[PDB]
Amino acid sequence: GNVDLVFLFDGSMSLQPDEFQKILDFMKDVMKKLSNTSYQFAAVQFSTSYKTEFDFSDYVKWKDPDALLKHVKHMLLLTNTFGAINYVATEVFREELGARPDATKVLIIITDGEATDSGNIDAAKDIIRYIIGIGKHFQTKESQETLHKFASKPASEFVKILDTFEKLKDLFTELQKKIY
């Protein structure tokens, strides 16, 4: 079956340059490992504001992850996660931007800290949502649990807590094996 997958990636000032680069490299690696499959991809950077770095139609045009993310600049502002998820739901999953009506909608949210905004993500309820929380801001159970509201249920499936950015590589086998 077809899968339309969006990477929603944190560009806040909490991320160090090498950490941000590791997020980019992970997205590229995931795409390369799923090239010429039923997958199509889009990517959105979020910080204070939201930017579609490439749409599904861009992916279909280029099919080159290096090219698609070549123009990304680290935003270096806040962490407005609620609005970011709603932005994906309303502004990226659109047929006119290459989204396929028959596809399963999937979000991979990648962040290094707690949201600086609030509200709800009701608009994104029909999207299958994974969240990857990385690094020392998620050392405590309480901090980890703040991510549950953004992800699908059960949290034990959809919330991934990684202690280091180097651990992103450990997700590839699992991601490749998913059958939606």
Ligand X SMILES: FC(F)O[C@@H](Cl)C(F)(F)F
Strands 50-54 and 39-46: antiparallel
Toward ligand X, which CB reaches closer, 36 or 156?
156
**What is the rounded distance in angstroms from the CA atom of residue 61 to the CA atom of residue 53?**
14
Toward ligand X, which CB reaches closer, 49 or 172?
172
Which x/- pattern, by CB under 6 A, does the window 124-143 give for ligand X?
------x-x-----------
CB environment 150-170: b (16+ within 10 A), e (fewer): bbbeebeebbbbbeebeebee
Compute the least distance from the CB of residue 158 to ligand X, in Å. Answer: 7
156 binds ligand X (CB under 6 A): no
Other Cβ atoms less than 10 A from the Cβ of 144: the count is 15
Q: 102, exposed or middle or buried, with CB in 10 Å at 0-12, 13-18, 19+?
A: exposed
108 binds ligand X (CB under 6 A): yes
From the list 13-21, 117-125, 144-152, 171-179, the region that binds ligand X by CB under 6 A is 171-179
Compute the least distance from the CB of residue 96 to ligand X, in Å. Answer: 24
* Binding site residues, ligand X, CB under 6 A: 106, 108, 130, 132, 160, 171, 174-175, 178
